[PDB]
């Protein structure tokens, strides 16, 4: 616990004062639908839109209130918007506006044009270890930030990590993020990325994010996840078994880090010991990482996405376009009153 650790501590203290102000007094109803021209679907929904008054492009997430109710996601959706409007960190996508109408909820975020990490990783096959380390370091700092605010993220995966014009990561989709000081119990996440304590229906805490980091680093460096199969149940059987196999090109340092992150024993999992995140940040695999330089975006990125111009979506897949219908009757008003 030296001078560098005290500075992190003080930085996180100021970050928490700012977060809590917005957490306790959330912003609400800061734009309306006809402020935007709708361009194209970016994921399924999230749409590219253009703000008329400024000409800025944004990514607008649209949720059908009736479908949220049927899927029992009311409280998770209130979590997502309340957390997103309160956070502020370089590697988190920024929420610029939110609002609702008779049918839908809307979250309008900064447009990140470089595409999902998922698309680049699948196309290239795998990332080199320096490449994967660059991205992993950003997730390490982002979880240090989120966890210090008593937030658990619970859906880390390449599909949710966007590459910006500087080649850095922006985390999107807070649909399962939750502020909780005790343990929690919800069965949620993506199968390949679930910690064993989730699968086995135990109480669990922020250590599930550090397990998921282990899955992410493995998938970036290997090109495939550490546990995969054609059916989710078969994936879960592999996750709880306690064994992991590594590609032969994995360095010795990388395997040792992943055995400590993909650790079924919670009393032994990195990120969850007395030293907290510093067991990770001081691991030999991260010896060349300058954490301050990463935070300041001063490190040279592995690649810069192709940019054809404003509003171009060539780094995203194409999706079938569907109408945005707004009923003449208010749906689910009481359930979403605080949104």
């Amino acid at each position: 616990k030296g001078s560098e650790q005290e500075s992190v501590k003080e930085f996180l203290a100021k970050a928490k004062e700012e977060f809590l102000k917005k957490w306790e007094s959330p912003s609400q109803n800061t734009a309306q639908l006809d402020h935007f021209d709708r361009i194209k679907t970016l994921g399924t929904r999230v749409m590219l839109v253009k703000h008329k008054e400024t000409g800025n492009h944004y990514a607008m997430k649209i949720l059908d209130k009736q479908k949220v109710v049927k899927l029992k996601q009311i409280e998770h959706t209130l979590n997502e918007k309340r957390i997103l409007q309160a956070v502020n960190f370089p590697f988190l996508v920024k929420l610029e506006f939110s609002f609702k109408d008779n049918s839908n909820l809307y979250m309008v975020m900064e447009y990140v044009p470089g595409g999902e990490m998922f698309s680049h990783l699948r196309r290239i096959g795998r990332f080199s270890e320096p490449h994967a380390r660059f991205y992993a370091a950003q997730i390490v700092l982002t979880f240090e930030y989120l966890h210090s605010l008593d937030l658990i993220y619970r859906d880390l995966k390449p599909e949710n990590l966007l590459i910006d014009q500087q080649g850095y990561i922006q985390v999107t989709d807070f649909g399962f993020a939750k502020r909780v000081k005790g343990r929690t119990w919800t069965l949620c996440g993506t199968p390949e990325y679930l910690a064993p304590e989730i699968i086995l229906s135990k109480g669990y805490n922020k250590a599930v994010d550090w397990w998921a980091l282990g899955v992410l680093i493995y998938e970036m460096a290997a090109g495939y996840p550490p546990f995969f199969a054609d059916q989710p149940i078969q994936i879960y059987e592999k996750i709880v078994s306690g064994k992991v196999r590594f590609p032969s090109h994995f360095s010795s340092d990388l395997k040792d880090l992943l055995r400590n992150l993909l650790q079924v024993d919670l009393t032994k999992r990195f990120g969850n010991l007395k030293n907290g995140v510093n067991d990770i940040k001081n691991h030999k695999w991260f010896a060349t990482t300058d954490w301050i330089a990463i935070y300041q975006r001063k490190v040279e990125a592995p690649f810069i996405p192709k940019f054809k111009g404003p509003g171009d979506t060539s780094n995203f897949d194409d999706y079938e376009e569907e109408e945005i219908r707004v009923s003449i009757n208010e749906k689910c008003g009481k359930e979403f009153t605080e949104f």
């Binding site: 949620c188 390949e192 995969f228 054609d230 196999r245």
Partner: peptide, 18 residues
């Protein structure tokens, strides 16, 4: 190879939350 097994599997596309 494990890569070949992954590429021929049904879970190389985007994965939905549970």
């Amino acid at each position: 190879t494990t890569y070949a097994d992954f590429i021929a599997s049904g879970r190389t596309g985007r994965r939905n939350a549970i």
